[PDB]
Every structure is written in structure tokens, then in C-alpha cells.
Amino acid sequence: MQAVRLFQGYLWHPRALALDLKALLPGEVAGARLLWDEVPPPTPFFEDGTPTHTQRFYQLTLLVLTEEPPEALKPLAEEAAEALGEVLEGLPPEVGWLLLEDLRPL
Amino acid sequence: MQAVRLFQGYLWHPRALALDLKALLPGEVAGARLLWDEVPPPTPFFEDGTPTHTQRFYQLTLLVLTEEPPEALKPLAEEAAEALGEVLEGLPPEVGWLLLEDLRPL
């Protein structure tokens, strides 16, 4: 019944655009609590050369409560990652994001 | 003063290798508590095409205290990232790692 904050990736949107994430984001995903915390831009510029200081960034994390070992939460993380992906696609077009599934091979 | 959890990246090593991270890693970096938690592979493959399930992954986090807004921690975030990279360079070659600054979108 232990907790483990799994990093899912980042979400962002222009600082000029007002967005109420508490009304837009679900409380949980795949039965795991979904958390979003504001942080500095995780990199200076985007792929197109535009600056990131014009956007507000949020770390997305899933609070999982379990006892089994991490090398067994793979099912949850997968269901969650898919669910999260579909949640983000439902947000206003100006919202951007980078999720684990977007990472290049390590 | 609020405790902000800043995702730093990942660290990993062969699963068959019983390393003692508590003995290998420092307790803090740039005055902030360094946390590491075992999690599922963030991606299925390494750049060379080998599967990630052969390694045990750890999510790296820095617990930063600040009485200023989380979004203004970039100066400290950058100093911590530099210090953390140096720390990781000192670990055995069997340990792999990638910090936020190298994390790119496919």
C-alpha cells in the first residue's frame, strides 16, 4: 500500500492563456491519482527555435499505491500512459506536452 | 517554504548487478535532498536497439526548498543539474544515466 510518484512527463501552455487545470484534468487515471505541479521550463527552446520562457510548465506524475515491485507496475504504467495520452488530446489546442512514450530510445 | 520535487532524469544498471545506490550516490546535491526510486523502464529500447527490461531503472528527483515560486527555480535547477552530472560521472561504468537536459522528443 506504499506510494510511488511516477514521472509521466510535462504539460505546458502559454502564460498569456488562462487554463484551469483542476477543472480540465481528471483526478485519477487508471485508478492512480494524477498530479500536476508547476516548474521551471525543463529546456531553453522548443524544436522550432522558439523560446520556452513564454509558457508555464507542469510536471505530470501518477501517485501509485502498491506493495508489489516496480517491475510489475508495467501494466498500470501502460494503461495509465495510454489513458493520460487520451486525456491530453482532449485539452485546448494551445496546450503542449511530452510524455514518456515520446522519449527517444535512451 | 515549500518543498518542490524536480524530476532530474533516470539512472539504470543491469538487473543481475546488485549495486548499493545508498552507498554510491550522495544524500544531497546543491543543498537539496537527492531522491531515487525504482520504476518501470520509461521507454522500451536503448538507442542501440537493445531492450530496456534487462536493466533496473531509477527515477532521480531533487527535493528543493524555496520560499519563492516553483517556476523561478531555474538558476538552482541548472546548478543542481551540473553538480548531479558530475556526481554520476563518478559512478561505475556499469551504471547508465540520462538527465533532463539530454531528454529529446522523437
Side-chain angles (χ1 to χ4, degrees), chain A residues 12-101:
Chain A
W12 59 83
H13 64 82
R15 188 172 282 102
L17 168 62
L19 247 59
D20 184 35
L21 290 172
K22 195 159 189 176
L24 298 181
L25 295 178
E28 317 183 308
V29 168
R33 181 65 44 165
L34 171 55
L35 294 176
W36 50 276
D37 298 286
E38 189 159 27
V39 297
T43 193
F45 300 94
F46 289 107
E47 210 194 318
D48 78 329
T50 66
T52 61
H53 62 73
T54 48
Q55 314 284 128
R56 296 176 66 180
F57 288 74
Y58 302 84
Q59 288 202 168
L60 299 181
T61 73
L62 291 176
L63 199 56
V64 189
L65 293 177
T66 185
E67 188 175 309
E68 288 297 297
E71 43 273 78
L73 302 165
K74 201 62 193 185
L76 174 66
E78 199 68 63
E79 171 186 353
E82 190 173 59
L84 184 53
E86 295 318 277
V87 161
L88 302 183
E89 295 172 310
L91 289 163
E94 291 243 73
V95 181
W97 68 81
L98 174 75
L99 298 185
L100 300 188
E101 70 175 299

Side-chain angles (χ1 to χ4, degrees), chain B residues 3-106:
Chain B
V4 184
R5 300 182 199 293
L6 300 177
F7 168 73
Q8 296 303 311
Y10 298 98
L11 169 156
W12 60 79
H13 61 70
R15 96 185 341 272
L17 195 64
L19 300 181
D20 181 354
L21 294 181
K22 186 175 185 179
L24 294 165
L25 297 163
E28 60 177 82
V29 175
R33 175 64 71 221
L34 173 59
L35 303 172
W36 58 88
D37 298 282
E38 184 167 12
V39 303
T43 198
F45 305 96
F46 283 114
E47 180 175 271
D48 69 0
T50 53
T52 53
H53 74 65
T54 70
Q55 318 281 142
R56 178 160 313 180
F57 286 77
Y58 290 80
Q59 169 179 289
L60 301 181
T61 296
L62 280 183
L63 188 59
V64 182
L65 293 177
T66 176
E67 189 25 51
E68 291 303 321
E71 62 268 40
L73 288 176
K74 196 60 195 178
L76 175 52
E78 189 153 279
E79 306 181 313
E82 199 177 306
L84 180 55
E86 295 272 35
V87 162
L88 298 184
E89 298 182 332
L91 298 187
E94 286 85 356
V95 179
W97 51 274
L98 214 54
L99 306 186
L100 187 51
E101 64 195 74
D102 288 318
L103 279 185
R104 275 51 219 258
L106 71 317

